[PDB]
Symmetry: C2
């Protein structure tokens, strides 16, 4: 009519929440009886508030409220029907399986990935998913997980964070992981979580709620990780790698020109032959191996994203169920698309769903 597809939309299955509920170290879910909803505590930047609340009963509630929407497949479908979304490509949210002990991670990752497949089977044609990987485990266990996700119905990709195997995404030990995913034609969805070292937010950090780590930390983290991939030659070494970047590439469309200029003016790089004239620029990679979600909350940002990658490589997302009304968050981004490319346009239909349908083969199984 045409189809609306949401590619940035999360869940924590009940089995995953139940795990978080039993933890005493981040990530965790903890009930504070002065609030009905349990608190979801995921982030390094939240540790200070957690500790303050664990000592002083007068301190503010740490983390964010855990609504039922995080774990309810039924509320996901309700959200879709209420918002005119025909298909969601759901993904486990941060920090995935990153925090698990090496020995246990593969069994848990594999169980949870299968639960996602089973969730999609309940609503055939309306749900597909990005699987996540046991990246704290040895690479051979990670490969075994990739081999399993390749066989799972409704799986169309992999969601992962910026830590890789623990040394980031420019780690050559991670290359076989990108390679095995790309060879299986799975889209890689890169998503933030670790943000930036907390000291950058300053000694008044606790006064600003979650604004700085979420509004700045997250997209900057994404940008740094993809820039490191680019500099390390990951996009040339895995030529068929295709990546979807969270939050319109973080800040990448805005900084792409600056990155190119710093590269071609880097004396050391140039003098040591690391800037050959046939180098694939960041602009070329943005056109050939990167897709951007449209979760940017303004036509200013969206226009830059579109100018960087083309309208055929932008994909609508909501980031449901984060940022509930205190869903404006879904609608603002839909409006941003229209302002950017005009209502009823082929570009609008592309961004709102047809790109995702094409790239992620949102029919088969």
């Amino acid at each position: 009519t045409p189809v609306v597809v949401d590619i940035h939309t999360h869940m924590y299955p009940p089995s995953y929440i139940a795990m978080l509920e039993k933890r005493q170290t981040i990530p965790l879910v903890r009930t504070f009886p002065q609030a009905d909803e349990p608190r979801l505590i995921l982030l390094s930047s939240e540790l200070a508030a957690l500790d303050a609340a664990l000592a002083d009963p007068a301190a503010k509630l740490p983390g964010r409220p855990l609504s039922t929407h995080f774990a309810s497949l039924a509320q996901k479908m309700h959200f879709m029907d209420t918002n005119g979304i025909r298909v969601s490509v759901i993904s486990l949210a941060n920090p995935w399986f990153d925090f698990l002990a090496p020995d246990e991670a593969p069994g848990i990752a594999d169980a949870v990935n299968a639960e996602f497949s089973d969730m999609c089977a309940q609503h055939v044609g309306r749900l597909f998913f990005f699987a996540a990987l046991p990246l704290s485990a040895p690479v051979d266990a990670v490969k075994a997980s990739i081999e399993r996700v390749k066989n799972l119905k409704y799986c169309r990709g992999i969601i992962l964070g910026t830590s890789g195997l623990g040394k980031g995404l420019d780690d050559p030990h991670l290359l076989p992981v990108f390679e095995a995913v790309a060879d299986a034609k799975l889209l890689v969805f890169l998503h933030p979580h670790y943000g930036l070292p907390n000291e950058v937010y300053g000694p008044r950090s606790e006064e600003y709620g979650h604004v700085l780590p979420l509004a700045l930390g997250f997209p900057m983290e994404t940008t740094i990780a993809v820039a490191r991939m680019y500099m390390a030659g990951v996009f040339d070494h895995v030529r068929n790698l295709q990546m979807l970047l969270a939050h319109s590439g973080g800040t990448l469309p805005f900084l792409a020109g600056r990155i190119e200029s710093c590269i071609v003016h880097d004396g050391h790089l140039v003098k040591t032959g690391k800037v050959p004239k046939d180098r694939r620029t960041i602009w070329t990679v943005l056109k050939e191996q990167i897709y951007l979600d449209a979760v940017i909350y303004s036509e200013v940002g969206l226009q830059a994203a579109i100018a960087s990658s083309g309208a055929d490589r932008l994909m609508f997302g909501t980031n449901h169920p984060f940022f509930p009304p205190i869903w404006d968050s879904s609608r603002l981004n839909a409006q941003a698309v229209i302002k950017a490319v005009g209502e009823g346009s082929s570009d609008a239909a592309a961004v709102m769903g047809l790109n995702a349908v094409r790239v992620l083969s949102l029919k088969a199984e």
Copy 2:
């Protein structure tokens, strides 16, 4: 008509001579392998130690005469079609000095910039720097001295403030004094991000990550902190020029706004009233953006954020000389931005005229 460059730096010969004698970053050091090395950044410390210890690569960047020579500045202007420069000390300014030595050198160096501008009246104005490692009293004394300095049109400062960043309440009297004196504040990065974010392969990428990412991100965090702390509301006459088209601010402005209005704690504790001045409003009323963005993509975003009347052309001379071209010829790191202006707003348009210099002339009262 007039081309004005508001993002263009010098280290006076006095400043370099000090750097040549220094034991720790920042410093200038000669190496037998080649031109002195300029070593400024924390990201350069590992390379410095390894070079002090044979065939390790040259640390820092080549210290050409372009950093120190007024004649070279004018020549660069005359080979790049620039009529007027508003020059500034380069990072890290007076930041690294002991609190005791900083006032004396800060003021001597500000006086030298005024002297330099007097050599080329009408073509040179400057942003002054402040002894922010010293007590506030000395910072205020320096402000009072720069207020009376001929050809001074503003202050350049980093993100560290007095040592606790720009949301530091003790810094509010400094912003008030500068804003009352009608001095534009040119916010410029230096400290980047903590080096661990660049990872253990950091060394293989030359300076690309600290400069291409760390700098504009540092700027963005500093201004966001100022904004969140109410600085712009508390000092309503404060005007700020942001380096590198605001770092990443025009791209993240929407995200920042969304995160604020959806922040449960902030909203429920009354920190997000309905009449709050948004970042979009501050971007149109108290913020100017330079056009040092190297692409019409980023430039168009900056223009949509602050308006074409609040964008100002700059080059960042002399930091990115051509590597395989004549440094005495036109610089591509300056031609790129000029072209970005053309692509974004059209050659010969009044918007081009505004961005290329007329905005700077108006806002900074140049003649």
